[PDB]
Symmetry: D3
Subunit: 144 residues, 6 copies
Amino acid sequence: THTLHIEEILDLLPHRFPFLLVDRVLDFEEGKFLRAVKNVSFNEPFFQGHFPGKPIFPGVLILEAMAQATGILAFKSRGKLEPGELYYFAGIDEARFKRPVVPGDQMIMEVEFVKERRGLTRFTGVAKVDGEIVCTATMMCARS
Amino acid sequence: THTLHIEEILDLLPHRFPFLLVDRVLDFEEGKFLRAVKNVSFNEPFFQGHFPGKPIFPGVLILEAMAQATGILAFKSRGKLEPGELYYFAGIDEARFKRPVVPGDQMIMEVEFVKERRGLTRFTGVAKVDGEIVCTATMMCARS
Amino acid sequence: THTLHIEEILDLLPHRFPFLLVDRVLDFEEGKFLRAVKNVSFNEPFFQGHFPGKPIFPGVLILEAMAQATGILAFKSRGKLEPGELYYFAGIDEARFKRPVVPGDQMIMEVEFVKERRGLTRFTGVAKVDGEIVCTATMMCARS
Amino acid sequence: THTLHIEEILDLLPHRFPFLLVDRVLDFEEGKFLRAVKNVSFNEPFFQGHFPGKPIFPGVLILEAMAQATGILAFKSRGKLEPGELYYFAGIDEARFKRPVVPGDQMIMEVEFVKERRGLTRFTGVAKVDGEIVCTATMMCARS
Amino acid sequence: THTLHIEEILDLLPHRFPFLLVDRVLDFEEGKFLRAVKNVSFNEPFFQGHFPGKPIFPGVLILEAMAQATGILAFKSRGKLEPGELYYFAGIDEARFKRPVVPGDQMIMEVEFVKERRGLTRFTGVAKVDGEIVCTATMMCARS
Amino acid sequence: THTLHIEEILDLLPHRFPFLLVDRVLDFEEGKFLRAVKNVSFNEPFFQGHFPGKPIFPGVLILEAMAQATGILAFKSRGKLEPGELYYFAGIDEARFKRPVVPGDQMIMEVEFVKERRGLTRFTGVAKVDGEIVCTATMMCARS
């Protein structure tokens, strides 16, 4: 119902190529949840290195893509970043990688706001491919 | 039933980054048809240039990706390329671009063998997004 | 007589790296024709992929470069793009690729306005290397 | 006393550009610890995107670089990877990012083997700049 | 005492990725000298080409990095570039390359103003790694 | 009469993208001279950084390209490099840059063998555009 396409994304997040890893927002409810898509394509620059002969989307970039999806939720819910402010990744708990994500996968990511605590915001994220979980993690993010 | 993932694709086509534009094969029947996926992601290198502020997947790259999908069909059907042989794009008729393809689109491509003619092979292709046609073309390819 | 160098080109076309494929305009007459140069260098990013061991300038990028050269004609003849407007590739007829274009080739391209029809503009293009034809095509372009 | 330069690293790890994030090994003791350097330079490709006007080395890439440093320890200690085998990132606990790492920083990373557990190996890592901690994490890695 | 970090550098020099080769300024005295750092990392794009299997930082890029460091001195000492003006490399005398610079090296560069002569400014530069000289040169630079 | 195209060049020089800067050899006489072409195209990766809004081919890359052209002469004249051997740039005298080289320029480079001296070989080079000199230099190169 509340979808954002890439130009709307570019207006919210400061990330640019080759480190903008949210391709679409499928739905969100402010202060609660956001569901985003990362299309995984062979034609992405990290796959040349990771690895030659055997393309594997880096687990660390799933954590990043989910953190980005929290940022989009945070900005739509609480206000846009002001010029020069940034959205800092502060911590991660319990990241678990279940199986490799590969070219052709459409990675569906769901992030949920948990609480604010200290000047940090805590989110959970779950990433799926073809309805199955490929990654979970709990993420802490802060605006400076 | 007959799916090929990226490693199988890399073994068939000689194209490499940043010009390998088939991410998966969903089905095929040798000598007849092939259905392939190109995942369209913001994190592809041509989107920096095409265009700043407004990402549009180039129509010429839809033609490329379909031509590559003919190559995979041709190789699986007729034999792999020999070292130093190439799969040449010889011509295109009636390419039509119906609307823009954008980050987050999964472009489903169907190619069909038509006939061989004067040392050339003729194919038709149709590319879809969300079940709607975004491009059609007739393609002529040759080995040499 | 009416030459445009790259900064003038950058002011007319919205394309940027790695998808700006017109390096110079040698001559033009508004509403009629334009003659442009694409220098083909090994140091272009697509050649890593197309193909390892055997650099071949992609035919699809000749079509693009010619379409770009039509855009430059269109903008100089009829007015510049307004912010957010774009120059859409709508169709191609009868693209023919005669032989491979390679590193060291200076690709001379000549585009001619044919007619407007529906809200499309029709152009013919011919690309030469060392005075010989390497590609022809008829292109349809539209401003949205 | 036990230093490895980049060619020795390239022979141990399968990662390549733009995802090989260990530039040198300063010391190690098989089965115990490894100390590595990641030089952080503006001329790295992710800084274009992260972020325009404000270069910040991604925290997720500090985790990657430390995971790579565990791989080098694992290979030197336990044996090189066999062709087609991979060094998989299975999980992370308690990653904490203490302050931003920036161009001109030399990031010194110390990884320690903790134990093997259910087919996984557990490692702790600590990354420093100018003697101060910028990141800690506990990492689980597996061969397959 | 007078250090400049990368955002200050980006405000002074017009160079951007992949050709900004000064990561930090350690000290300077206007009109006299400047001491700068170039961190040499495997993750820089030229190392893919220079050379496969054997990363060697190009000597020509040491000359560039030093010329950049002269520009930063020139701008801080004599005034910033005005929009559209540029800082031209006009000549080099007696460049000498002593040994290869490699991934993991922190290249410390010291440039000294010699004199102005014609509308050129003459500088000497010396680049060190681990306290040893790896390159010297005399450089002539001009503002247009 | 003695021309070498890119595949012949790739077999002689070890440089690869984005640091192979000789696109064709127009003529040569072993032990004496070589004339090579570098096509200068906007679609080269360094132009993004050098400079935004104003593309200028770096003078240091003219020196590189001429050094590469000496390498091709050296290999054709004296023997190919053995695996793991490199063609080292040892020094430069009297490099002079006469005016900017820009997208659309075809840079014609003439290198001449001067003499061997203390385990080094000395060469002169002259680079032209449209028959006019844009750069001269004396280059010292060594195998090791």
